Nucleic acid binder design. Structure first.
Ligand SMILES: Nc1ncnc2c1ncn2[C@H]1C[C@H](O)[C@@H](COP(=O)(O)OP(=O)(O)OP(=O)(O)O)O1
Ligand SMILES: [Ca+2]
Length: 430
DNA sequence: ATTATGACGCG
DNA sequence: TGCGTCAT
């Protein structure tokens, strides 16, 4: 009743760039605009591995992870842009820099949490309060929400997508009580207006389009964002949760897309998020642990408290390269040359990071994979990162892993290494 | 022979 | 502290 929390205390948005690496390449090369196109890395093996795909190309069934040779079978006119290669490896600098462009624009509107190279969470609670004050009871026009969907509407007593969007929006706004500055639904609506403004600024200032979700927490905002892509935003109200969750596969919710979600399904014998409501908090804790159990209990009711962390910069700077099948490094010399290549890229990125962001990494993490291991990583060791010097970093990394060589003959390496990874971590202010 | 990233919880 | 998990 009066004491049952409803998790409607915050307004949180999640902004997610549409087919990001593709847009970066399309801005640069207008020939790629409004075409089926994809971004690929490493042309030689099966045409290269696809890592991003335009919506035009998705219509043909082109997907990430597909080899370009195979994508061409589905879409013979598929256009391709290649990831830059430097020092014998893919180099993602262009995309990291494009990401900074967007993150800096978003930061003008509110504090952001960088979730990935092209996603950020925004806590709009304070901004919404301010905008509500300026509005002073004034109604919110549908014109302020030109690309917004209201999940769950229209409902109750046009056959085209845009017609439906407007019908749903109209029902939502018609029902809104703009009188109360503490109405959660009103707060979400004002949040959506601000996100329209944010997304317009991103597009004006970078050329990039994105989608967004607006709701009361990060999980719902993320879920909302994916409901209407691309180039649209979706408001998921607290009230929309029971219907939305009633047919929502568990794996769709963030953090449940893997083994835990599979266990929830198997152990409880359910399929949809809404079905979770029938278990007590203790029951859920009994199967999935205290933390997960409490999280699931609240989440299936649309409630979650993870804060939007004030963090715009990545916490680590790393680089890695696989050496698959035949290319597996089998000589100390090889291991040393490749560690150096990685270290030179790392040095370059670290030096730029130190100049831009007034911080220095203090720990170097070295990771490798050995042939045959099904695990992404087979090992991880750390050493002090005391100088931004590629030769020193690569020498220290070697020193740290050299004891893995089961070889008897000094020169050779066994078993061959199929992955090298260097990561700078533990930043301090400088 | 997907590959190249990045954050976080358990212990 | 190293590993596993989950995600872009
Ligand atoms: N598994 C991956 N390997 C390498 N790069 C990836 C991988 N997943 C994503 N990326 C890169 C390329 C993407 O353009 C960028 C953002 O990823 P993501 O948001 O998942 O898809 P996307 O932005 O290409 O399409 P969408 O419009 O569906 O968001 O990160
Ligand atoms: Ca994206």
């Amino acid at each position: 009743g009066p004491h049952m929390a409803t998790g409607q205390d915050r307004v949180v948005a999640l902004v997610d760039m549409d087919c990001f690496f593709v847009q970066v390449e399309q801005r640069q090369n207008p020939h790629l605009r409004n075409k089926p196109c994809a971004v690929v890395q490493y042309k030689s093996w099966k045409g290269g591995g696809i890592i991003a795909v335009s919506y035009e190309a998705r219509a043909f069934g082109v997907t990430r992870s597909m080899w370009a040779d195979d994508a061409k079978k589905l879409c013979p006119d598929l256009l391709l842009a290649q990831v830059r290669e430097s020092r014998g490896k893919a180099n993602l600098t262009k995309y990291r820099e494009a990401s900074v462009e967007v993150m800096e624009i978003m930061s003008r509107f509110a504090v952001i949490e960088r979730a990935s190279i092209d996603e950020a969470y925004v806590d709009l609670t304070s901004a919404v309060q301010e905008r509500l004050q300026k509005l002073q009871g004034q109604p919110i026009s549908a014109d302020l929400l030109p690309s917004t969907y209201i999940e769950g509407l229209p409902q109750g007593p046009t056959v085209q997508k845009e017609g439906m969007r407007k019908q749903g929006l109209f029902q939502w706004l018609d029902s809104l009580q703009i009188d109360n500055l503490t109405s959660p639904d009103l707060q979400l609506t004002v949040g959506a207006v601000i996100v329209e403004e944010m997304r317009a600024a991103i597009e004006r200032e970078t050329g990039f389009q994105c989608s967004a979700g607006i709701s009361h927490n990060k999980v719902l905002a993320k879920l909302a964002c994916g409901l209407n892509k691309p180039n649209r935003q979706t408001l998921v109200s607290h009230g929309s949760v029971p219907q939305l969750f009633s047919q929502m596969p568990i794996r769709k919710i963030r953090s449940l897309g893997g083994k835990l979600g599979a266990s929830v399904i198997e152990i409880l014998g359910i399929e949809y998020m809404g079905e979770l409501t029938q278990f007590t908090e203790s029951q859920l804790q009994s199967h999935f642990g205290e933390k997960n159990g409490s999280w699931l209990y609240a989440m299936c009711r649309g409630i979650e408290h993870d804060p939007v962390k004030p963090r715009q910069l990545p916490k680590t700077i790393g680089c890695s390269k696989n050496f698959p099948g035949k290319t597996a490094l089998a000589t100390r010399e090889q291991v040393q040359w490749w560690l150096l290549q990685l270290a030179q890229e790392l040095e370059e990125r670290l030096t730029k990071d130190r100049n831009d962001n007034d911080r220095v990494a203090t720990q170097l993490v070295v990771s490798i994979r050995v042939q045959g291991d099904k695990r992404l990583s087979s090992l991880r060791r750390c050493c002090a990162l005391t100088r931004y010097d590629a030769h020193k970093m690569s020498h220290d990394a070697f020193t740290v892993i050299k004891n893995c060589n089961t070889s008897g003959i000094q020169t050779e390496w066994s078993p061959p290494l199929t992955m090298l990874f260097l990561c700078a971590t533990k930043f301090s202010a400088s």
